[PDB]
């Protein structure tokens, strides 16, 4: 769909994802592809198949934020599936083909709401008129100047125009309605009354299977925990079941959905793993052969936490100025202080257990937990979190490793 | 009754008389035979009830509306329907109208007339009215709304059924 270059995407990519560049243009070249193959006959069209990915990397560090900022980019149905979801199957749970209906239920509670988007103007426009014609019921057969119905644009014009927010008039309109009403309700009951209309069926849901089939995002988290590991046997043949349940999906079939007959062929694949105690190569053949794309992500870095508390757009720290806002009250992070909430995320995750980029999002919280009671109280005032401020609410979490379990 | 209707040197008129007549007697002297209609734009007069005329002549202002203006066609199409719906086909009656365009007769047979030079004389004193403002129209310099007039009185004079009460109705345009 987007004629984006890959340049371009991982540009795009770039407000949202701190580092991670390899992944970014991996995820880039995907995206493209899927452009490059309606440039060409209909032979090729049929031979060329996604370039499935496999991100590696641990923990928090970009590797979901990458492939929803990628599916989001692109207005395409994304899913996001933990592999081991399935590994309790051999005793009874979920099929593998849940994947590709909820890519569509999705698929569908998208092309759902954004049929809102283009028809939230339509029902207060060519369906305002509703009301307009029981405020001055038009006349017995206009006659037809074409600019007559456009005449009262006087009498007309002024109903329209005290129609800016004056209301709470019961009158009644039309099964149509006919029923008796009021004004909060009639104008209302007609906001979705006329809507109905002009978004049809068969076109609707019959896109959503358009837009999995051609634009389709599949994000198996943890692909690795469904490798064979020396540990057992009887749980690796439930793991490498996965892989084979999931093998039908990657490599090309039709998928049964309360919505039609949806094809795999051409969904895109982003697999992630840690890759700790199994390796790439532990999944089977047929599945390394349905991810040829390998790339890795990096730790982050307390200079990438930094970073990632402030660069992005709508960042956590950008949000919280504006929520605290919401209560009049104007928040302001010095450079320091920023350096120190970073500082402490990296701590905690070296004292206790690494979650990556997550521990902010938690200590960012705690530190603020006060500001964010009080700040009804504040309203008017201009509080500045400093590195000062920051200390003195997080030191003594930190420094408290067993508190820092439960806590932070 | 006596519907007289002219058009001399941009000037259109229709002008009738006001007796109803029950048999040997006069029920009423002063009814209004010449109307107007589309936003006064179309002027008309007509012989028959006063229920008919309500009914014919505001249908006939749709018709207008459902074709721009156009006299000729709102009229086809209203002697249509006159003729065929099954209700309608009971209304009696004798309409005259005119625009700027042009001036016709219409009746209950759905026929749509354009007479000589839109000169109309419907009703029993159609002729006499008739007569006498072809003379007129002839012989004199006399304007549009002169002659109506004068043929009227020269009708209401001979005719028993029509008398000298007048509704004019004039239209300018050039
Ligand atoms: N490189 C990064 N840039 C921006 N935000 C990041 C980055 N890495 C992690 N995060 C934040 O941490 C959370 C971790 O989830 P995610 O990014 O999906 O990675 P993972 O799939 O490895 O757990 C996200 O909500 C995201 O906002």
Redesign the pocket.
Known sequence: HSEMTPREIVSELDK?????DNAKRSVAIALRNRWRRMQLNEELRHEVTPKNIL?I????????????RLAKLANAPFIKVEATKFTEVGYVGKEVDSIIRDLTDAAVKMVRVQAIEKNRYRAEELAEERILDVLIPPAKNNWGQTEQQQEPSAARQAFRKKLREGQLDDKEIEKQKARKLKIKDAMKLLIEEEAAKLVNPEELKQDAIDAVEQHGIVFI?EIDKICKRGESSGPDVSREGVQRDLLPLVEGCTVSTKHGMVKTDHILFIA?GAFQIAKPSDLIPELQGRLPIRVE?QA?TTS?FE??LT??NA??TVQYKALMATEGVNIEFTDSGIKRIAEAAWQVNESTEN????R??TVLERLMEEISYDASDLSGQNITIDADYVSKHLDALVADEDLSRFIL | TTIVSVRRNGHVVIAGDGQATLGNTVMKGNVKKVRRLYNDKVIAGFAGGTADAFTLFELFERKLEMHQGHLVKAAVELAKDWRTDRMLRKLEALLAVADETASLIITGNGDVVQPENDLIAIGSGGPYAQAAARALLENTELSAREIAEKALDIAGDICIYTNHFHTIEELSYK
């Open positions: 949202h994802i701190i580092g991670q991100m990397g641990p923990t928090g560090v970009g590797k979901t934020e990458i492939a929803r988290d992630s992500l982050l990438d970073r990632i660069e992005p960042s956590i979650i990556g980029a997550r902010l999002h």
